[PDB]
Each structure stands twice: as C-alpha cells, then as structure tokens.
Amino acid sequence: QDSKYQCVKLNDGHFMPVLGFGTYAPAEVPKSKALEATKLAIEAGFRHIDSAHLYNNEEQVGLAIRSKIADGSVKREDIFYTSKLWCNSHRPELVRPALERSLKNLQLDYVDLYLIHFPVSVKPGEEVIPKDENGKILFDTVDLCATWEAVEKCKDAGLAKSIGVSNFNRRQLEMILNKPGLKYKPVCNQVECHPYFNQRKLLDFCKSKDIVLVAYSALGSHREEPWVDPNSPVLLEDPVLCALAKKHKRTPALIALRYQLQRGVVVLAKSYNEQRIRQNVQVFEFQLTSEEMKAIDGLNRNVRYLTLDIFAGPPNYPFSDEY
C-alpha cells in the first residue's frame, strides 16, 4: 500500500511482507556479494528475503540476517525468510534432512516459508542436477502428494512456519488441494510474473483457493545464459514502462513492481546494487491509475524467461499446460 512494511495474511494465519528481496545471483557473481547485498536490503527496509538451497548462497544470506539481528537493526520475528526444497530431495524421507541442511547453513532455527521449488523430481544425491554420461538428466519418480506430506511434517515440527510451492501449474495445485487427508494448503505459489507474462489465469486461480501468487523475475529476470534466452526482449527496456516511469518521475523497475502490488501479487526484486536496493523500496511511495494498470496489462506477450526446459519430458514439467 503506502508503507514498506505492509504484509498480507496467509491462509495459515502467518503474515508475509508484500515486497521481497531476491537473493539469487548468476554463477559468475562472486559468492561474497550476497552477504553485503542482503545486509543493504535489510538496512533499506526489506524484511521478506527469498532464497533456496539451489542458489548456493544460504551460508552468506544467513550470515547477513544474523548480523542484522545481532546489531539490533531487526529482530528475528520481523524477518520473513524463505527457503526451498530442491528436486533431488523430493522423496519424503529426504525432505526433512534437506530443510535441516539449509537451516545448518543459515545457522537459523526455522525458516518462515519452505517451498517445493520445482515439481520435477531428479535422482537423490549431492549433485543438484544429476546427469549420466551423454549429459542426460537423471529423473526420479516421486508422488508429489507424498512430498507434500513430508513438507507438512516440517510445519508440524516447527522447522518451517509456513509451507508452499513454486512453479506449480493449476493441475499440480489441484493435486495437492484435492489430496486425501490434506493438513495444510500451500500458502503460496511462487512463479515467474511480470508485464510480459502477467499470469492472469493462474493469479485468479490462486486467489480462488486462498493461495498467494508470489512473483519472481518481476524485473525481467537475471537473464543468465543458458537458463534465459539471450534473444528474448528486455523487460526494463519496454517503451511503455519507460514512459510511465517518466510520467511518475520513477523508473521502469518501480513501475513493474508497483504493477504487481496493485493487482494483489506479492513481488520479489533482486538487486546487489546499493542504489537500486534503496530505490526498490520506494515502490510504496506512489500509485498507478486504473488506466495505467490497463496499459500495463496490454504489455502481456507470452514471454516466459525461465522455461526450465532442461526438465521438459516428465509429465510433471509444469509449463506445457495453458496454466
């Protein structure tokens, strides 16, 4: 709304800040950078911090969070920290060890939110993306409902305050929602969402089920090759976003973030730049008109930056369905 500490009530009674700090950085960015950036994010007013085992940064992100708690800047209760279960630990018996491993790296006792990162399961082991000779990904067959049950036990244990999913399509959400003996609905579905891929149908569906849609790559993504097609249009270079930025005396990034806030979406924003980190929290300072929101709706162009198509094949690959 108008305060950078604004939150939304999740379906389990916990509260999530509507603006989150994204912590992923491309492989070529030195791992030391995550520490300072996360500290700066907290100093700027970010409270919701998003990471995952896959991002290989939890040790640094954890260090930053704990440093800010230690110096009195924030209390643990005011930080909303998200981790995610990777595809190599979908087997029910491997779920808790994965969360405990993340917690050990963070040196924290609980996460505020734990997500199933991506619905396609891969063979268990140290390698996050296991491959045979020939370079073919080794997939594993796991019942996602069984995975969910094990995630539910993590909430029972108090290791995760809230639980949810990421990169799930409508069918996959329904599979969890319709599961016999379901204990906890997912609080959220974290998916790619920006003016070029606005997710209207999935957003409406999540809302109908009391599931929050959390937008990742909301500024058009890190554009890291080969995960993102280098020939895809650059979101922040959009002429309409630029024109709206000029009208409001803001920036294209701020317009893209504000768009999500006004349509009921919780939005992430990654930056490792001091000026841009401070800039992003200014999203709460202005409002887009209904006419401008409509103009941004028009930017929709079916550009999905993160296809994760290396995981295409198994029926659980989520992006084949309409939504």
Ligand X SMILES: NC(=O)c1ccc[n+]([C@@H]2O[C@H](COP(=O)([O-])OP(=O)(O)OC[C@H]3O[C@@H](n4cnc5c(N)ncnc54)[C@H](OP(=O)(O)O)[C@@H]3O)[C@@H](O)[C@H]2O)c1
Ligand Y SMILES: CC(=O)[C@H]1CC[C@H]2[C@@H]3CCC4=CC(=O)CC[C@]4(C)[C@H]3CC[C@]12C
To the nearest whole angstrom, how small is the minimum distance from the Cβ of residue 308 to ligand Y?
6
**Distance separating alpha carbons of residues 4 and 2, to the nearest angstrom:** 7
Q: Which two tokens stand for residue 290?
A: 């209904």
Of 160 and 219, nearer to ligand X (C-beta) is 219
Kindly calculate the radius of gyration of the chain based on its CA atoms and give it in whole angstroms.
19
| Binders in 3-62 for ligand X, by CB under 6 A | 22-24, 50
190 binds ligand X (CB under 6 A): yes
Of 129 and 295, nearer to ligand Y (C-beta) is 129
229 binds ligand Y (CB under 6 A): no
**Distance separating alpha carbons of residues 164 and 70, to the nearest angstrom:** 29
Would you put residue 56 in left (φ > 0), alpha (ψ -120 to 50) or beta? left
Question: How many residues does this entry show for the chain?
Answer: 323
| Binders in 85-114 for ligand X, by CB under 6 A | none
Other CB atoms closer than 10 Å to residue 195's CB: what's the count?
24
Q: Which two tokens stand for residue 254?
A: 């701020």
DSSP states of 9-24 as a string? Answer: E-TTS-EEESEEEE--
What mask of x and - would describe binding to ligand Y in positions 129 to 158, judged by CB under 6 A?
Answer: x-----------------------------
Binding residue numbers for NADP(+): 20-24, 50, 166-167, 190, 216-222, 270-280
Q: Which of 110, 139, 184, 227 binds ligand Y (CB under 6 A)?
A: 227
Task: Exactly one of 55, 114, 259, 317 is catalytic; name it.
Answer: 55
Query: Measured on CA atoms in the order 297, 298, 299, 302, is the torsion positive or negative?
Result: positive
**Distance separating alpha carbons of residues 158 and 160, to the nearest angstrom:** 5
Which residue is closest to ligand Y by CB? 24
Active site residue 55: yes
Which of ligand X, ligand Y, none does residue 111 bind to, with CB < 5 to 8 Å depending on kind?
none
Backbone φ and ψ for 15, nearest 5 degrees, come out as -115, 135
Of 51 and 103, nearer to ligand X (C-beta) is 51
For tokens 């009195």, the residue is 72
Backbone φ and ψ for 180, nearest 5 degrees, come out as -60, 135
How many residues of this chain interact with ligand X, rule: CB under 6 A?
28
128 binds ligand Y (CB under 6 A): yes
Catalytic residues: 55
- Footprint on this chain of ligand X (rule: CB under 6 A): 22-24, 50, 117, 166-167, 190, 216-222, 236, 251, 253, 268-273, 276, 279-280, 306
- Footprint on this chain of ligand Y (rule: CB under 6 A): 24, 27, 54-55, 128-129, 224, 227, 306, 308
